[PDB]
Structures are given as C-alpha cells and as structure tokens.
Amino acid sequence: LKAQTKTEEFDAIKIALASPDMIRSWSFGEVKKPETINYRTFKPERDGLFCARIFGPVKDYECLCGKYKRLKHRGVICEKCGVEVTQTKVRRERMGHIELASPTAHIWFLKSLPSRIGLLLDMPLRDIERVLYFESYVVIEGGMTNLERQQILTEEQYLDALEEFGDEFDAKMGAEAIQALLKSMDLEQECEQLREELNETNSETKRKKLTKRIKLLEAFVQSGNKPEWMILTVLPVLPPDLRPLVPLDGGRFATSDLNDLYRRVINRNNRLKRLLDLAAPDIIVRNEKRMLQEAVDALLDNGRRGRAITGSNKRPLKSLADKRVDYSGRSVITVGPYLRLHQCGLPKKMALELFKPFIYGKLELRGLATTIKAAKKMVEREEAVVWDILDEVIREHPVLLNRAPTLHRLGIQAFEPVLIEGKAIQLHPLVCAAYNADFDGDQMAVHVPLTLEAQLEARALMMSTNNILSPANGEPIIVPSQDVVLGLYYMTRDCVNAKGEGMVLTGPKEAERLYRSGLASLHARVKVRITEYEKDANGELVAKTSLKDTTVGRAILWMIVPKGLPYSIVNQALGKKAISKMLNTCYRILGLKPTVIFADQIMYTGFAYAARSGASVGIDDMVIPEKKHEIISEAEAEVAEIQEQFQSGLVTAGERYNKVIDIWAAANDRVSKAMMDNLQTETVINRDGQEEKQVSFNSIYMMADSGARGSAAQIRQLAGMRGLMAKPDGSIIETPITANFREGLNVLQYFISTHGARKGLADTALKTANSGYLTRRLVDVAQDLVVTEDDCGTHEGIMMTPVIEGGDVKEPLRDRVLGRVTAEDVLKPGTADILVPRNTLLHEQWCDLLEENSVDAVKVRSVVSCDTDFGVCAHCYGRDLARGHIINKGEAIGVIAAQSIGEPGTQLTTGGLPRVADLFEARRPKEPAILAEISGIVSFGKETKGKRRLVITPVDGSDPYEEMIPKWRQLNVFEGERVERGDVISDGPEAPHDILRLRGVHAVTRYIVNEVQDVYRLQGVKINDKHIEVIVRQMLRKATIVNAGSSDFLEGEQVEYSRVKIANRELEANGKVGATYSRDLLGITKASLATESFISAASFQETTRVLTEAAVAGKRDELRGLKENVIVGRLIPAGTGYAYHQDRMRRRAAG
Amino acid sequence: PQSQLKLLVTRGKEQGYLTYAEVNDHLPEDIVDSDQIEDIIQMINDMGIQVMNTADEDAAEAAAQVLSSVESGRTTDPVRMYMREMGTVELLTREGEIDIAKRIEDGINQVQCSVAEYPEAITYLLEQYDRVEAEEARLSDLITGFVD
Amino acid sequence: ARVTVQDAVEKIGNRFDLVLVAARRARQMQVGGKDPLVPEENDKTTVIALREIEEGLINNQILDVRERQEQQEQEAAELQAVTAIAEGR
Amino acid sequence: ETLRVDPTNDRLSALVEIYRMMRPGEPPTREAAESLFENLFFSEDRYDLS
Amino acid sequence: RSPGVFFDSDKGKTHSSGKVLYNARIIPYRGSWLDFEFDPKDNLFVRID
Amino acid sequence: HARSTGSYSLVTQQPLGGKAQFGGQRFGEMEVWALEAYGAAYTLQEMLTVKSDDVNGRTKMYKNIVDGNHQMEPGMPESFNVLLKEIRSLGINIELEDE
Ligand SMILES: [Mg+2]
Ligand SMILES: [Zn+2]
Ligand SMILES: [Zn+2]
C-alpha cells in the first residue's frame, strides 16, 4: 500500500538546517517591496510585506481587484492580479521569501556561544567576525604555497602574498569568505586525519579535544546538515496575519514590530542591489553589506548586538527569537454544610451561562425550540421552562472546581452541580482542608468537562468522593476540621455529675430519646446495652452485644458508626486525631462507600451538636495564673542579682547577658505551665461527695484540646506573658514582654512586637515562592516518569527498619513498611515458616501480622531499585493512592511525587526548606568530612605544604592511593589503626557523591531520604518515603562508563541505556564485550537538564541555545513525553491516554 | 606580571560566587560591552553559578570562556567600522579634483570614440530614426538632443 | 447519581480502562446505535455505562465481541452487494 | 600602594583614562576629557547636591 | 536615600575573607555618583556611577 | 464571572473578553500537573486544545455539543502551529515525520 502524502495524524517531529531551495519551497512569492498598504484603499500593495498575490485574499473567497467574488470560483488565479480565491485563513499560513544580494550570517549560529560556524571550522570567533566585517582577509584552501587554510591575513599581507603567488592560493573576506570556507570543507577527510592523529600522540590535552571534535564532526555528518546553510542566501518572510497591520478606533492602526524589521531588511537589501548595479566603490558596498548583516541579525534575534529600536518608540522592537479556556468561570465561595461530599452549590446564572450550548441543544432536542436561534432567544429571555431543562443537563454532568494556589493534585476536584440562588459558589466543608481555602473571601474557579471522556474522567478520577486520601500519605484528607470536631468532642466527653448519672438504657435509641427530652445530660456516666459487630469471620460479619460503660453522648453517636467497627472507637474523648483514625479504620475495614457516607454523617452531627453546645468565647474564658505576678517578681530579682554581679565585676558582659536571658526564658516556661495547669484541670465539682476534679469544660480549653483550633502556644500568648521578642538584627532582648493580650500592651511592647509580626509576614510571603520554585524543579526532574511495566520481578530492594533515633522510636517500622511490597519472603523467629510470601503488598492486616510476631526488619522493593527501564513497575512502586489498592498501570507517579513533596513545603522554616533544596541538589557541604578511599591500615605521609598527605595501605592490594588532606583541618582517623572504606577520616557533614561512590547506591539513597525526612518530620509533616525515593531514582539516572568494547570511555550516559546495552551484550554480540560503568548522583536541577525531547527542553531551558543545538544535530523529537505532548496539544502519554500512546507506539516501529 | 582575564575567573571560582557587579569591573579593559555579559553569565553559571544549581562538568566552559576573553578593537556597530574604514581615505586637493575629473573625461571620451568607430552603431541609429519618422517610435526615445 | 466508582473499579482493575470502556459504552448509548442493559433512572449515559460496568454485563471483552459480531452483521447484508462488484475483473 | 596600581602619570593621562572609562570605544580628546571631567561633578548645570 | 555622603561596610560576604571592607558614596540630588571603595589588597578605588 | 463561548484574540486564537463579557479562566502549568497526576488525558486535551487554542476544534466541538454528541476531533492547537511558522521563518527547517 502507498504510504501517504496528504495530512494524516503525524508522528514525532524533525528539526534541521534549511537549504536556500528548501526555504524557497515554503515561499509562494518574493517580497520585493517595503510597502505595506495603499494608504487610501487599505488593500495590500502587490508583492510587499502585505500582499494578496503572494500570501492571500483580504476577504474570504474574494479576489483583490474584485473580479471573481463568487464562492463558486475557487482554484481560479485571477488574470488582473494573480490571487487564488480561498479563505482568508491561508493568509495566516503561506510563507514568503527574499533573495539576498550578498550572503548573510545567521546570528543564532554565529553568536550562540557554541559558535557553531566557529567550532565547526575550528576557527575562533574574533577571526570570523573580523572577516565578516571586512576587517581582514582569510585564506580558503590555500593549496601548497606558503599558507595555512584557516589562516587570516591583512590588506598588505594579502597584497604581498598575492604578488608572490597569483594562483594556487586563495583568500576572500566577508560573508562570502565564510560561506566558501564552509562549502569547501570536506568532513570525511578531516575525520580520516583526526582518527590517525588521535591514535598517534599520547597526551590528555591532545586526544581529549581531538576525540570531542571528531565526535562533533561525525555527528554533523549523520545529521544531514551541510555547513553552507549556516550562511543565509534566501531569507523567509513570516505570514502577514502573524504580524497584523489591523486597524483600530479613531482610524489609527497597530502592527507588529516584525514589519519594521522586515522593512529595514528589504530596504537595505534593495539598496545593495542598486549599489551593485551602479558599480559603487568598495568602501560603500561594504558598508551596505554590513548594514544588511545588522538588519538581518536584528530581524532574527535582536537580543544580541545593540538592540535596534522601533519607529518613534524608545522600546526595542521585539524580534522572532523574542492559557485562556472556554466553558469556565469563577467567584467568591461560601459554606453550604447541607451539601453531601460529592456535590457543590452552583449559582443559577453561572450554570446557565456555562452550559449554554448544552441548553440550546436539549431545548431544540425535545422540541421546545424551533431552532438554535429560537433557543438563544429563549434563554436570553430566560423563559420559565429553560430552568427545568438546565436541571436536566446538570444532573449527571460533573463540574471541576479549582483554587488559586494549586500544589497537590487535590487542588482541582470534580463535584456534581446543585443549582443555587445566589452568585456565590457553595463548597463542601470537608474539602476545605484539601484546597487550603478559608472563607475569608478566597475565590474559586469552575470548569466544564465537555466531552464524554472528560465527564467520565471527572467522575472516576477527579471526583471528590473518589479521593478521600492524601497522595502524600495514606491518612484521610477528609478529616473534619473545626466546628465539627468541637461538636463530636462536646458530644463525646464526660463530666463528674449530670442528669441520668449511673442509670441504664436498652440502647442508643432511648439514650438519644432521654437526652432530647432534657431528662438526661449529653455527657453523663451511664451503662448501656449496645450491639457491636465485627467482620472477623472469613468475609462475614459477626454480631455481639454487651453492657458498655460509656456516656449518653457516645451512645448517641454510635448510631452513626456503621457495622463492623468496634464500640471502642467512640468510647474515647473523641479528639481530632481519634476522629481521624476512626474514619481511617472505617476505610481500611468497611470499604469506600461506607467511609464516605460515614464521613458525611460525622460532619452533619458535628455541626449539629456543636451548634447545640452553645460553645462561645468570653473575655473571662482566658484565665491568667494567680501566681504569674509572683514569678515575674522572682525572675525580676534574678535579673538585678546578675546586674549587681556585673556592677561588682563578678561576671562579664556576655555572661551577664546570657544569664539574664536564661532566667527570663525560664520564667516564661514557669508562667506557661502555671496557666496551663490552671486552665486544664481547675474545674472542681462534686458527685454525691465533697469534691473531685476533672478536665475543664472551659470553652477555649475545649477548642485547643479537641483540635478544633488554637494551641497551647497561642493560649500561652493569650493568658501568660508572650515570649521575648527580638530585633531584626537577630539579637534577642533581655527584657521580654511581660504583658499578654488579655492585659493591655503598652506602647514599647507593641512597637517591638510589630517587627516579629512583619518579618513573619515577609518570611511567609517569601517561603510561598520558595515552595513553588521547589515544586517546579521537582516536577521538571520527574514528569515523564510513569508506571509502565507491571512487574519487573527483581528481588532487589532496601532494608526497612524503624528509625530508632536517640531514645525510643522516632518513627515505627509499621509505617515505613506499610503499603509496600516485600522483596523476599521473611520469617518468624523460627523458620521454614513463611508468613509473608515473596512479593505481596503489605496492607493493614499483613503489617499487623508482622506486628504480632516480633519482626524487626523487612526488605522492601523500591522505585530506585526497579529493573524496569524508562519507568517504574507497579509491583515495585507500592500501593498508596486515593484508593487503598495497589498503584494503577499508567498513573503518572513523578508528578504526584513532586507535588506531594512540595505541597507541605510552605510549613517548613543547618535546617529548614533550604536544607531540603540543598539535599535534592546534591551540593557538597561547606566544611565536609572525607571518607576512607579504601580499607586497610593508614599513615600520615610527607610534611606541610598546603596539605599533609595521607597514604593508605591495603592488606592484599597495591597502594597507589594517596590522598592529600589539608592538615590545618583537625583529623579523626587513627594513624596506627586500620580503617574500612567509607569510614570517618574526619568529622563534619558528608557529600552524597562520596556516599554513593564509596559506600553504595542504597547507602546514598538511604542518606537522602533519611535526611530530608528528618527535615520534614521535625516540622511534623507526613511524606511517605516513596516520593523522595522516586526523586532519588531520577537523581542517579546518569552514569559514567569506565571500561570499553561498545561505547566511549568518559561518556555520561543513562543507566537505562547502558544497562540495556550490556544486558543485551552479555549474550549474542561479542560473547561478552559489555562495558563497566559508575553510577552518578546528579542534582535535581541538573538531572532535569537531560531530556531526549527538544520540544520539552525548549520550554524550561534557554530556548535559543536549545533550538540551535538541536537544529545542527538534526535531532528528531519522537515525543513520548508528557511536556512535549502537552505543548503539541495531544493526549498525554500517561493516564487515560496511556492506552492510546501504547497502542500507537506498538503500531509504530513495526509491520 | 600581567595576563588579565584569568583573575576574575580564578577568583570567581575560589569564592564560588561573584556579584553581577563583581565581574563587570573585574573584566579586562578589553570587553566592556553591555550585551557581552548576557551569555557569559550563563557560561560561568553552568560551571559554578552566581547570577546575583549548575553543571559540575566545567572544562569546556572555561576554554571557550577564554576564547571569549581573546574575542574581547572592533566593537562591531557598523557605524564604527565604517567611520573608521572611510577615515583612512585622504582628503582631496583642489587640483586633485581636476586631475580625477580629467581622467574621467579621458575615459568616457575613449568609450564614446570607440562607439563612433563601429559601423553597426551608425547603421542602428539610422534605422532607428527611420523608425522614428515612420511613427513606430518617438524622438525622445532615440536622442536627448544633439550638441544643441 | 453514582457517588463512588469503587465497584466499577473492582470489576475492571485498571481504573483508567474503567474510564475508557465506560466512555465507549456511554458513546454506544449517547449517539444511539444501542440501548441500555440496565433500567435508566434518568441517569445520563455516563452513569448508565458505569452501572453497566458494576453489574459485570459490560467490559472490553464483551464490547469487542459485540462489535466484531456487528461487522459480520453488516457483512452478511452487503454479501450480494459487494460480490456484485465483480466489475473489478 | 594605590599609586603603585595607578597606570597614569600626569593630569592629562588621568583625564584620558577617565574619559575612556566613561565613554569607551572612541578616541579621547584633550578638550573632551577636560569638558567631561569638569562637567561631571564641577558643573553648576549637570551637578547639584542642593 | 538623602543626598550627601554615606559610609558603608559590606562586611562578611565580600570575598569571604572576613576582612570586611569599607566604602564611601557621594550621592547628589541630580548628577553622577561618586563612589570610593577598598579591596582585599587595601588599595583604594573610585568609580563614577 | 462565567463564559461558554466568547470572542477570540487575533494574533493567537485564544479566548479573550472584548465585550466586558469575560475571557475564560487561565489554565496554568500547575493545573496541567494536576490533570497529569490524575489519569485524565482527555480532560487535559480538551482543556488546552478544543476548548481554547484550536480554531477548528472549538466550532467542530460546539456543533457536536448541540447535536447531542459528546466527542472531540482535536486537531493541532494554533499556538504550536504559530510556533512552527516562527521557527521555520528562521534558517530552521522543522518537519513532521512518518504517517
Ligand atoms: Mg486565606
Ligand atoms: Zn482580481
Ligand atoms: Zn520494580
């Protein structure tokens, strides 16, 4: 079958140098005149920057002169003025050209610091420019006389050399010279010489540059490009519609600067033609040629040179080198607690305007409207019927909600529209956590999933209810926020004595019936008969009932708790954490739907009982310690004691300072732990006896304790004194703020407080941008990484143990191993007993089985060790997702990894967020520790010059290794003792490169993850090891070859490519010629630099250099990646489109 | 005692960072250009960046930078190279103008006389005037007038 | 409405393929070549298709079989028509 | 030590170096160096602290 | 910034030597800036603007 | 604010409010990452192709929307086509290979 010619669905893309004839191919005419339009009849002047003949008609299917105006005549070229009558859109398509009188250098290739003409000719830049401007001659193919080929001469020198040799010697100057140079160049011969010369002389300096240049040359050869094309003969002109002359109000016009530039080029070129036909002296024509060069250079890239300015406007004209979406909206948002988790309140008018085409279609579908026009007129009139029609089109049609600071994927979520009277969008409360959206006037945007696939994608993926879990960690993101948790807290709780204390009831029903009638208090100690279930039988619910000692409120609440959950979960005090673990266990037991509806009911009851609770905040609710003033007085005794000591000279200045600052710092804690006790347990009440005391029912304490809002620090700032603020200088004042907010703050205290507040504001405002930037670098380094294979089937993995830092368990084993697959079957303390067989996803039950037994460690497969090339296998990755099931095939994990790492990054403050940045960047620390290069006994050699050399002595092996260690740095290593490779030869931080090379891949992959997780966990942030492990996988992506037999020696190359080539070379080919390598750690920003697709690289990297460097190589972008396919505007090679791209990829490179 | 550009380089490397102002003055007196800096910040930035995070490769980012240091004279800006190129040509003497003009006269009169010595150059004019009086042409398109 | 696709995901495990297949089916219904396999509650073709996935009466295998059958349903029609095109000889 | 790092000698030389520093690329002139340097910080027109 | 003379330091970061540095700056209401600044070699310098 | 189908920019065809009828919301890079994290390609394609930058795709879609047929015949976004022309306007030859 004949392949094809006319437009199909294309694959890949190719970029290369353009031939003069190739350029003329695109051009449908030459633009010979600087003129644009006629100035009266605004029609385009023929063959000019704007032309109907060359480019296209000014109006659809209408000839310029107006001869053929009919839609019938089409392929007709008019006789008066040749214009094919066709849509005006082809004036946005057809290109043009200009034939340059003299050759002109292409500025991108001339100066883009790989000066391409230069390093292709092995000729320095200044010589090339000195030639181009006629400031000197350059030899070309000098033959056998006196002179080198690339050698440059001057006026006198050239004259003399010419007088000596008339022929068999050649020299030119200007652009023509460079062109002749390039054209004359034979790549083959140069190659043949370079190889021999490479082989003969042995020096690093020589053969390094030699091999680099021969590689460059052969690359350029295989490219298909020819050197001449770097020098411009024909100059293409951009379609007129892309540089519009379009009019405006008041008769005035507006136009692109490209018209000014192109006009300059045309004029100078024409003047050059004339000056050639007029036989001007050289001094003139040379100047005209230089001016033409300037004009062309300014037209292409005006960045360089002197930056020519547009007419009458100082601003430099924008050169050639120099998204809004329909069906959408936005507005202020409100609560709507009545909503189910799966829906959101959508304003009537908004929904009307959004679904307008759907409304038209349905309206004339049922026959309510004669035609679409009539439909428009109807909804424009807003006739009463159309509303009901809207209710039809809204029902199963989801909408997308999005907020401004989008970080993690939950930043956009799909809901089901519920028509609302008002202009505000009602957003479900439980989702307010995911969006990070307060109600203080934040706005949200709506989108409409038009195509069927978009609706189903919205419902099965982007839906609210389908994501109940944070992608960062398995913990529920639907956890009730504030009002609700204060509701369940006030509900589930007990005081010492109340109505119905001690009585007994048949069940929750008459418990609630007792409460609602005012007979029994919401919180009272009561025994009630409850029936709790358990699914502990195989796939089956077991029922049991008993007398539980609980409170009326907990009994009432139990009515909501579904099925197999134990009563024990609602028998606590029900704080925010317990109320979260409730939902979590509910999810890992009953499944999704029960968890959803449970969550809803939890919110409703929360708001309800919080409303009934009558919880408020008064000024007397904040209790200042009675002993505060006394503590103040005592510490204030200390300060003058130390003052009197400084006056007697017993203590120094700095010592006095530290002492006073310490005594105040202690005073703060004293007052804090006074007010805390007083605000906590001080309620003293009586049941049938004298007294007894319990946790206070004081309002603000309830809020802070429940987890609704407020915290011990802030409560500390309300009641007790607040801190000891500090100037911007960083120095901390030894006279702290003794007054609190409840008390009045005098002028000073507040003044000094202002700073702290502002620096807080400024710093937060800055860390926003920092977090964002980090997320950007992170998604750039990952991106295209997506689950591709299913199971790579490697036994390889990392050893998981609890962190055990300092004292007991800074992080458990169960957490680290949860949701992860086992590398190999682990054992009980006794063996021939396989509890967890081979590779099995470790879920809740499994981890609990591991917890039953005493197991201290589990080997776990990771994304960093996965044998799959160009991606990750689902088996190795893990489970975690919005769903508890194992990761799907084709889900893009790099994006979510980066998002999950960067989203909490706002909450981060050596240490802090910049520490995370330095970590991912692989940067060597300021004053690092040096590890032992090789095991064996060591000794200190030589003496003091700049360094004192350390000589290693391996037992069996040789001792070529001697490392020169600067001696002014205090050492660690014992000069009389042996040290293993990767031991401490000094203290201080260690470069991850060293950890990788000397210790191991798993060693360094553990170092990074543990360090960054130290940074996050110190701030109380949950991020699964997974994401960081994928970022690490991306960091170590490259490697440097050591041995040979296939590829070049020092080449940095993909571990994927390499491993693929050696595993392929271990068999077939040479028996094994396979080459060794060395894994290499690359900082995220550096690893992001490496991308196969040039369209991808042209985005985030520097555009010019990328396009040029790719163009000279004739690089062919096969797409295959996310970014490039986004740019080109086709389905992402992941997720839903993964099937497509899969299928297609297989159809390609095949029969 | 001398070689300039090493020093801003060798220092910029040892400090690990250099202010955007640090390089400007530390640059040799050779390259002062404004748009010069634009790509050299990228050059130093891939090898040890300070734009006030990079590639540890270095190597060729020095050899080419030294190639940019040798490329630091001619400031391009064709107004300059022109003003200078024409500035060489010597001024004319009042008599020299007469010399040159006389040379012109000799030349042009030579080619005219060479034309007059061609028989076909005569016959053509004759036939053309035969076309003029035949209303196949006009008097203005043949002669601009004789001497007169 | 269909609030949770958990069951539909349970049937066909990929969950993206869920969206794809359900899209195909929802297309079979939307521009009518066909009719629902489950009672329509006024649920749009989207939710109807999802329900059809839940009940296990619709999936890639089934749809492919049905379409492949239809190829021959139409092929049996034109059997005289296209064999009548022996003019190519 | 500063004088030791001074490439110039007399007034005119320093003026040339300053003129070349301010407006490089173009040939210096005596009247130009004097005019410039006097017009910088010493002119009632181009300079005021008020 | 008020017109007049201004004496600054730029201690620390400059050349990472801890040797600090010292600079004076003459800022006119209207006109060119007159800057004086030291270096690690203790050689006084001057820059216009 | 709300918009279904409004006016369009001349230089690159993109939704632009000219009547005080507002232009569409801007779908940014981070939002694209959000759609990328979800397995939703079609939502994204229709987001940056048919709903916005495709001069043919928008109308060809609209007709289907009113016809009662939800599909998309995406074609190539006008932005990348403009970039094809801008790149190709230089000495750079950019081609689309195979079939
Ligand atoms: Mg806010
Ligand atoms: Zn015509
Ligand atoms: Zn794997």
Please tell me the distance between residue A96's alpha carbon and the centre of ligand 1 in angstroms.
53
Residues of chain F neighbouring C16 (CB-CB closer than 8 A): 39
Distance CA C18, CA C4 (A): 13
Distance CA A776, CA A797 (A): 29
Q: Do A471 and F37 touch (CB under 8 A)?
A: yes
> How distant, in Å, are the alpha carbons of A1046, D27, E39 from that of B26?
46, 23, 12
Domain spans of chain C, in order of start: 1-89
Residue A209 token pair: 């540059």
Residue A845 CA, chain-centre distance (Å), reads 34
Please tell me the distance between residue A336's alpha carbon and the centre of ligand 1 in angstroms.
18
Q: Are A1123 and A783 in contact (CB under 8 A)?
A: yes
F19 touches chain C (CB under 8 A): no
- Counting one residue from chain A and one from chain B, the pairs whose CB atoms sit within 8 A come to 64
Residues of chain D neighbouring B80 (CB-CB closer than 8 A): 25
Q: Are E36 and E23 in contact (CB under 8 A)?
A: yes
Q: Are A466 and A882 in contact (CB under 8 A)?
A: yes
Q: Please, which residues have CB within 8 angstroms of residue A575's CB and are 6 or more apart in sequence?
A: A485, A489, A705, A706, A707
Name the residue among F31, F48, F91 with its Cβ closest to that of A402. F31
For chain A, the residue count is 1151
CB half-sphere exposure, C25, CA atoms < 13 A? 29
Nearest chain E residue (CA) to B26: E39
Amino acid identity of residue A610, one-letter, is A
Distance CA B42, CA A1103 (A): 13
DSSP state of A317: P
Neighbours of A63 (CB within 10 A): 24
Name the residue among A95, A326, A1130 with its Cβ closest to that of F5. A326
Interface of chain E toward chain B, CB-CB under 8 angstroms: 15-16, 47
Angle at A464 between CA A459 and CA A465, to 5 degrees: 85
Question: A627-759 belongs to which CATH class?
Answer: mainly alpha
Distance CA A871, CA A306 (A): 47
Q: Are A1104 and A321 in contact (CB under 8 A)?
A: yes
Residue A585 token pair: 């266990």
Nearest chain F residue (CA) to A376: F66
**Sign for the pseudo-dihedral over CA of A747, A752, A755, A760:** negative
Q: Do B25 and E47 touch (CB under 8 A)?
A: yes
Any long-range contacts for A391-394 (C-beta under 8 Å, 24+ apart)? Answer: A391/A419, A392/A362, A393/A355, A393/A358, A393/A359, A393/A362, A394/A346, A394/A351, A394/A355, A394/A419
Distance CA A208, CA A1050 (A): 10
E partners (3+ CB pairs within 8 A) are B, D
Distance CA A921, CA A906 (A): 19
Select from A553, A508, A543, A514 the least CA-distant residue to A529.
A508
Residue B71: helix, strand or coil by DSSP? coil
CB half-sphere exposure, A957, CA atoms < 13 A? 10
Q: Do C20 and A1136 touch (CB under 8 A)?
A: yes
Crossing angle of helices A1103-1113 and A204-223, rounded to 10°: 80
Distance CA C43, CA A335 (A): 27
Nearest chain B residue (CA) to E48: B25
Name the residue among D18, D40, D50 with its Cβ closest to that of E29. D50
Residue A864: helix, strand or coil by DSSP? coil
Strands A412-420 and A343-347, bridge-based pairing: parallel
Distance CA B85, CA A284 (A): 10
For chain C, the residue count is 89
Distance CA F22, CA A490 (A): 47
Distance CA A483, CA A493 (A): 16
**Sign for the pseudo-dihedral over CA of D39, D40, D45, D48:** negative
Distance CA A1083, CA A1068 (A): 36
Binding annotation of A: 63, 65, 78, 81, 438, 440, 442, 792, 866, 873, 876
Amino acid identity of residue F68, one-letter, is G
A725 touches chain B (CB under 8 A): no
Residues of chain B neighbouring A1085 (CB-CB closer than 8 A): 53-54
Strand partners, A937: A953, A978
Backbone angles phi, psi at A317, to 5 degrees: -70, 135
Which residues make up the environment of ion ligand 3, defined by Cβ < 5 Å?
A 792, 866, 873, 876
Please tell me the distance between residue A419's alpha carbon and the centre of ligand 1 in angstroms.
26
Please tell me the distance between residue A355's alpha carbon and the centre of ligand 1 in angstroms.
30
Distance CA A243, CA A251 (A): 19
Q: Please, which residues have CB within 8 angstroms of residue A114's CB and are 6 or more apart in sequence?
A: A1105, A1108, A1109, B64
Q: Please, which residues have CB within 8 angstroms of residue A527's CB and are 6 or more apart in sequence?
A: A502, A504, A547, A548, A549, A550
DSSP state of A257: T
Topology of the domain comprising C1-89: Eukaryotic RPB6 RNA polymerase subunit (3.90.940)
Residues of chain E neighbouring B25 (CB-CB closer than 8 A): 47
Name the residue among C16, C23, C30 with its Cβ closest to that of F39. C16
Angle at C14 between CA C10 and CA C19, to 5 degrees: 90
Amino acid identity of residue B12, one-letter, is G
Which ranges of A976-1093 would DSSP assign to H, the alpha helix? 992-994, 1001-1018, 1025-1035, 1055-1065, 1084-1087
Please return the burial class of A837, using the count of CB atoms within 10 Å of its CB with bins 0-12, 13-18 and 19+: exposed
Distance CA A353, CA A433 (A): 29
Distance CA A936, CA A955 (A): 6
Name the maximum alpha-carbon separation found in chain C. Answer: 60
Select from A116, A890, A327 the least CA-distant residue to C18.
A890
Q: Please, which residues have CB within 8 angstroms of residue A533's CB and are 6 or more apart in sequence?
A: A541, A542, A543, A544, A563, A564, A565
Distance CA A399, CA A454 (A): 10
Strand partners, A1052: A1040
Q: Do D49 and E29 touch (CB under 8 A)?
A: yes
Neighbours of B103 (CB within 10 A): 10
Q: Are A931 and A999 in contact (CB under 8 A)?
A: yes
Backbone angles phi, psi at A845, to 5 degrees: -50, -50
Closest ligand to residue A52's CA:
2
Closest ligand to residue A85's CA:
2
Select from A17, A187, A219, A215 the least CA-distant residue to A109.
A17
Any long-range contacts for A209-212 (C-beta under 8 Å, 24+ apart)? Answer: A211/A1048, A212/B60
Q: Please, which residues have CB within 8 angstroms of residue A828's CB and are 6 or more apart in sequence?
A: A835, A853, A855
Residue A272 token pair: 């050059």
For testing contact with chain D, the best of E6, E36, E44, E47 (most D CBs within 10 A): E44
Distance CA B74, CA F74 (A): 53
Residue A487 host element (H or E): helix A483-491
Crossing angle of helices A576-590 and A483-491, rounded to 10°: 90
Residues of chain A neighbouring B70 (CB-CB closer than 8 A): 124, 126
Residues of chain F neighbouring A353 (CB-CB closer than 8 A): 2-4
Distance CA A645, CA A656 (A): 8
Residue A534: helix, strand or coil by DSSP? strand
Residue A541 token pair: 């619910």
Distance CA C21, CA C32 (A): 17
Distance CA B102, CA B92 (A): 14
Residue A341: helix, strand or coil by DSSP? coil
Residue A325 host element (H or E): strand A324-325
For testing contact with chain F, the best of A28, A436, A450, A462 (most F CBs within 10 A): A450
Residue A956: helix, strand or coil by DSSP? coil
Residue A817 token pair: 């191993």
Which region holds residue E10: left if phi is over 0, alpha if psi is between -120 and 50, else beta? Answer: left
Tokens 């290109």 sit on residue? A95
Residue A548 host element (H or E): strand A540-551
Residue A3 token pair: 């392949």
Distance CA F94, CA F99 (A): 16
Q: Do E32 and D21 touch (CB under 8 A)?
A: no
Backbone angles phi, psi at A175, to 5 degrees: -60, -35
DSSP state of A932: P
Amino acid identity of residue A1127, one-letter, is I
Q: What is the spatial order of strands in the sheet that A962-965 belongs to?
A: A937-940, A948-953, A962-965
Residue A136: helix, strand or coil by DSSP? coil
Rg (CA), chain B: 33
Binding annotation of A for Mg(2+): 438, 440, 442
Closest ligand to residue A333's CA:
1
DSSP state of A782: S
Residue A390: helix, strand or coil by DSSP? helix
Distance CA C49, CA A460 (A): 12
Residues of chain A neighbouring C49 (CB-CB closer than 8 A): 456
Please tell me the distance between residue A53's alpha carbon and the centre of ligand 2 in angstroms.
9
3-state secondary structure A710-735: CCHHHHHHHCCCECCCECCCCCECCC
Name the residue among E4, E34, E42 with its Cβ closest to that of D41. E34
Residue A352 token pair: 């009307």
Nearest chain F residue (CA) to A772: F30
Distance CA A199, CA A192 (A): 11
Query: What is the span of the domain harbouring residue B50?
Result: 1-70
Q: Do C15 and F39 touch (CB under 8 A)?
A: yes
Distance CA A143, CA A168 (A): 6
B29 touches chain E (CB under 8 A): no
For testing contact with chain B, the best of E8, E10, E16, E48 (most B CBs within 10 A): E16
The DSSP code sequence of A643-703 is: HHHHHTTSS-HHHHHHHHHHHHHHHHHHHHHHHHHHHHT--B--SSSS--B-S---HHHHH
Rg (CA), chain E: 12
Q: Please, which residues have CB within 8 angstroms of residue A88's CB and are 6 or more apart in sequence?
A: A56, A57, A58, A59, A60, A241
Select from B13, E43, B51, E18 the least CA-distant residue to E10.
E18
Backbone angles phi, psi at A327, to 5 degrees: 50, 60
Angle at A273 between CA A272 and CA A275, to 5 degrees: 60
> How distant, in Å, are the alpha carbons of A326, A1149, D29, F74 from that of F71?
16, 29, 76, 9
Neighbours of B85 (CB within 10 A): 18
Residue A849: helix, strand or coil by DSSP? helix
